[PDB]
Design a protein around this motif. Sequence first.
Motif, mmCIF file in Angstrom:
data_model
loop_
_atom_site.group_PDB
_atom_site.id
_atom_site.type_symbol
_atom_site.label_atom_id
_atom_site.label_comp_id
_atom_site.label_asym_id
_atom_site.label_seq_id
_atom_site.Cartn_x
_atom_site.Cartn_y
_atom_site.Cartn_z
ATOM 1 N N UNK A 151 16.322 5.896 -12.224
ATOM 2 C CA UNK A 151 14.920 6.040 -11.860
ATOM 3 C C UNK A 151 14.010 6.206 -13.068
ATOM 4 N N UNK A 152 14.565 6.224 -14.282
ATOM 5 C CA UNK A 152 13.775 6.450 -15.488
ATOM 6 C C UNK A 152 13.149 5.179 -16.042
ATOM 7 N N UNK A 153 13.760 4.022 -15.806
ATOM 8 C CA UNK A 153 13.247 2.773 -16.346
ATOM 9 C C UNK A 153 12.747 1.877 -15.228
ATOM 10 N N UNK A 154 11.526 1.344 -15.340
ATOM 11 C CA UNK A 154 10.952 0.563 -14.233
ATOM 12 C C UNK A 154 11.667 -0.750 -13.962
ATOM 13 N N UNK A 160 11.829 -2.852 -5.695
ATOM 14 C CA UNK A 160 11.276 -2.296 -4.468
ATOM 15 C C UNK A 160 9.752 -2.292 -4.507
ATOM 16 N N UNK A 161 9.173 -1.966 -5.664
ATOM 17 C CA UNK A 161 7.720 -1.938 -5.804
ATOM 18 C C UNK A 161 7.132 -3.329 -5.597
ATOM 19 N N UNK A 162 7.788 -4.356 -6.137
ATOM 20 C CA UNK A 162 7.242 -5.707 -6.082
ATOM 21 C C UNK A 162 7.378 -6.358 -4.714
ATOM 22 N N UNK A 163 8.247 -5.834 -3.849
ATOM 23 C CA UNK A 163 8.616 -6.545 -2.626
ATOM 24 C C UNK A 163 7.402 -6.850 -1.752
ATOM 25 N N UNK A 164 6.536 -5.862 -1.540
ATOM 26 C CA UNK A 164 5.439 -5.993 -0.590
ATOM 27 C C UNK A 164 4.165 -6.550 -1.224
ATOM 28 N N UNK A 165 4.207 -6.941 -2.495
ATOM 29 C CA UNK A 165 3.048 -7.585 -3.080
ATOM 30 C C UNK A 165 2.727 -7.189 -4.506
ATOM 31 N N UNK A 166 3.430 -6.194 -5.039
ATOM 32 C CA UNK A 166 3.222 -5.819 -6.425
ATOM 33 C C UNK A 166 3.683 -6.921 -7.367
ATOM 34 N N UNK A 187 0.613 -3.578 -1.912
ATOM 35 C CA UNK A 187 2.058 -3.738 -1.850
ATOM 36 C C UNK A 187 2.794 -2.847 -2.831
ATOM 37 N N UNK A 188 2.267 -2.724 -4.050
ATOM 38 C CA UNK A 188 2.888 -1.846 -5.034
ATOM 39 C C UNK A 188 2.829 -0.392 -4.585
ATOM 40 N N UNK A 189 1.716 0.010 -3.965
ATOM 41 C CA UNK A 189 1.596 1.374 -3.460
ATOM 42 C C UNK A 189 2.586 1.633 -2.331
ATOM 43 N N UNK A 190 2.811 0.632 -1.477
ATOM 44 C CA UNK A 190 3.710 0.809 -0.344
ATOM 45 C C UNK A 190 5.153 0.989 -0.799
ATOM 46 N N UNK A 191 5.594 0.192 -1.776
ATOM 47 C CA UNK A 191 6.968 0.304 -2.241
ATOM 48 C C UNK A 191 7.224 1.589 -3.005
ATOM 49 N N UNK A 192 6.293 1.971 -3.881
ATOM 50 C CA UNK A 192 6.451 3.211 -4.629
ATOM 51 C C UNK A 192 6.416 4.426 -3.710
ATOM 52 N N UNK A 193 5.608 4.377 -2.647
ATOM 53 C CA UNK A 193 5.585 5.476 -1.687
ATOM 54 C C UNK A 193 6.929 5.619 -0.984
ATOM 55 N N UNK A 194 7.556 4.496 -0.619
ATOM 56 C CA UNK A 194 8.883 4.571 -0.014
ATOM 57 C C UNK A 194 9.882 5.193 -0.979
ATOM 58 N N UNK A 195 9.800 4.820 -2.257
ATOM 59 C CA UNK A 195 10.654 5.418 -3.281
ATOM 60 C C UNK A 195 10.423 6.921 -3.381
ATOM 61 N N UNK A 196 9.156 7.338 -3.434
ATOM 62 C CA UNK A 196 8.846 8.754 -3.592
ATOM 63 C C UNK A 196 9.308 9.542 -2.371
ATOM 64 N N UNK A 257 13.697 -8.523 -8.211
ATOM 65 C CA UNK A 257 14.006 -8.085 -9.573
ATOM 66 C C UNK A 257 13.479 -9.065 -10.604
ATOM 67 N N UNK A 258 13.211 -8.546 -11.797
ATOM 68 C CA UNK A 258 12.842 -9.409 -12.908
ATOM 69 C C UNK A 258 14.077 -10.092 -13.474
#
Length: 366
Positions: A151-154, A160-166, A187-196, A257-258
């Motif tokens: 969880x330390x490196x993006x 997960x962050x990119x999935x919904x539009x990030x 989309x980025x907010x939605x994925x990061x919120x699920x992570x948090x 993923x990148x």
Amino acid sequence: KIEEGKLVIWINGDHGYNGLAEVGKKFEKDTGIKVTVEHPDKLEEKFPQVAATGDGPDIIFWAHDRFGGYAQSGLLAEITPDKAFQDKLYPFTWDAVRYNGKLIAYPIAVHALSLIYNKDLLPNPPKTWEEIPALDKELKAKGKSALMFNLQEPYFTWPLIAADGGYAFKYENGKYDIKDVGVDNAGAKAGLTFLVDLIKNKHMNADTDYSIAEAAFNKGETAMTINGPHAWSNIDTSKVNYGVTVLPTFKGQPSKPFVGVLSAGINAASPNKELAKEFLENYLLTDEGLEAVNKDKPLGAVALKSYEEELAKDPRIAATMENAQKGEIMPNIPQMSAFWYAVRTAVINAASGRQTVDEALKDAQT
Ligand SMILES: [Zn+2]
């Protein structure tokens, strides 16, 4: 200056440089031209220095994300594959080696994150992110956990962050628009919120890094992790019965993923550009050439369609390419560096609670 009449190649020791030297032998045995493969330490930092004075190797092998900076400085020759050769490789791999509309390297190998799971603790891994909380509760009743990853490196949290539009930089018509960054859209907010929320509900821990996640999965403590092809060698020693599969979906959309592409570039100062093209196209980028390197050290997935079709008999490699085609090419533009540090801080701040998801992602936009 670079000596004419031979090929000097630089490739990192973690790749099959002995296998690459055997390809050089077939070249050196039906052309007359000698090929010397070297693996100097920190070659990716030495190359821009020596190539700036007109020196260095004829060919350099490295991840494509550094080749954008090389191309910015004019260190790489524009390559000239005709359309027939270009159709032999997956189209998205050519996107990784294009800079300012010019092809500046040959794609070789493809790297992307996958879902790694313990077949004993978990025989059928989940298909969506949404079902992971309940699966964690089932495993916790047995004293195991569902998922642990860095969880330390993006690099590891972005899918997960990119999935919904990030997204990083908008990519259209073959060009990145540096004025259009998408780290704090919906989309980025939605994925990061699920992570948090996974961390707030104690399904994951904010301090987990690469080492803690690897050690936990390799000792059978957790049922899944997220990692790339270079990590498989360690799981093989643990004798954990593991599989590699497609990443879970989020809101019906794939984790993205990148993608990193090991690429071969030709020094702009090389007087041997025609020899280098012959070597790379008609000796290395063949089934027989890639097999010689792969048997030395595994390449993972490859950009050459004909050989990837044989390599994908390994489900781990098939999963790697499946996640790669569902993801996005890592941008090679210089602004990408400022992106990574910004997203690195945002994910770290939102996971620990130093910032809310909205505030962390907004600060990442600038
Ligand atoms: Zn690699």
